[PDB]
Design an enzyme around this catalytic site. Sequence first.
Site, mmCIF file in Angstrom:
data_model
loop_
_atom_site.group_PDB
_atom_site.id
_atom_site.type_symbol
_atom_site.label_atom_id
_atom_site.label_comp_id
_atom_site.label_asym_id
_atom_site.label_seq_id
_atom_site.Cartn_x
_atom_site.Cartn_y
_atom_site.Cartn_z
ATOM 1 N N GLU A 155 0.797 -1.206 0.000
ATOM 2 C CA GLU A 155 0.000 0.000 0.000
ATOM 3 C C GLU A 155 0.840 1.271 0.000
ATOM 4 O OE1 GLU A 155 -3.069 0.445 -0.611
ATOM 5 O OE2 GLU A 155 -3.801 -1.621 -0.440
ATOM 6 N N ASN A 179 -7.390 9.595 -6.166
ATOM 7 C CA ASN A 179 -8.089 8.749 -7.126
ATOM 8 C C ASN A 179 -8.918 9.726 -7.931
ATOM 9 O OD1 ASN A 179 -7.350 6.137 -5.806
ATOM 10 N ND2 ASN A 179 -8.611 6.966 -4.135
ATOM 11 N N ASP A 219 -12.903 8.928 -8.768
ATOM 12 C CA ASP A 219 -14.000 9.183 -7.838
ATOM 13 C C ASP A 219 -13.750 10.337 -6.870
ATOM 14 O OD1 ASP A 219 -12.325 7.987 -5.954
ATOM 15 O OD2 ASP A 219 -13.659 6.359 -5.461
ATOM 16 N N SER A 259 -11.556 10.717 -4.389
ATOM 17 C CA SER A 259 -11.298 10.366 -3.005
ATOM 18 C C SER A 259 -9.785 10.249 -2.883
ATOM 19 C CB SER A 259 -12.008 9.055 -2.627
ATOM 20 O OG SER A 259 -11.436 7.938 -3.276
ATOM 21 N N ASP A 309 -6.453 8.308 -0.704
ATOM 22 C CA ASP A 309 -5.994 7.249 0.203
ATOM 23 C C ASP A 309 -4.880 7.893 1.051
ATOM 24 O OD1 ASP A 309 -7.664 5.245 -1.017
ATOM 25 O OD2 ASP A 309 -6.195 4.970 -2.596
ATOM 26 N N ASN A 349 -9.057 5.118 2.753
ATOM 27 C CA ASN A 349 -9.832 5.995 1.878
ATOM 28 C C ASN A 349 -10.769 7.005 2.531
ATOM 29 O OD1 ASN A 349 -12.348 6.291 -0.190
ATOM 30 N ND2 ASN A 349 -10.389 6.206 -1.270
#
Length: 130
Positions: A35, A46, A49, A51, A53, A60
């Site tokens: 990750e 991202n 969408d 959003s 991380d 998220n």
Amino acid sequence: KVFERCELARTLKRLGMDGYRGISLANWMCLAKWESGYNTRATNYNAGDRSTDYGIFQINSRYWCNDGKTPGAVNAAHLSCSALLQDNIADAVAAAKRVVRDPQGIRAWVAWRNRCQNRDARQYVQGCGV
């Protein structure tokens, strides 16, 4: 902060992650590795969408933490996403525990299925004394 492999392993064990909801420490290590590369300030936008991380576990902003700019956002964990960019990972761990309390468990992270699920994860904790 960028953790050293074994340093992180011990920290996670101390924070009660080993076997949390049936998830071994080796699996949490595998998740953090893919990750963020054990980097607490890792962030990923991202574009699709809108959003983001955040942190070592790439949590998220649409469901687990609040950053104010994520459309249709939820704050299940109830944390400010800023808390997930600290050197001290106590808040990122409490958030990670919350994520896996949902039926998906560790499968909530697609990266886990791709590179951790059904593999020999021993390599992430070997030699760390945990």
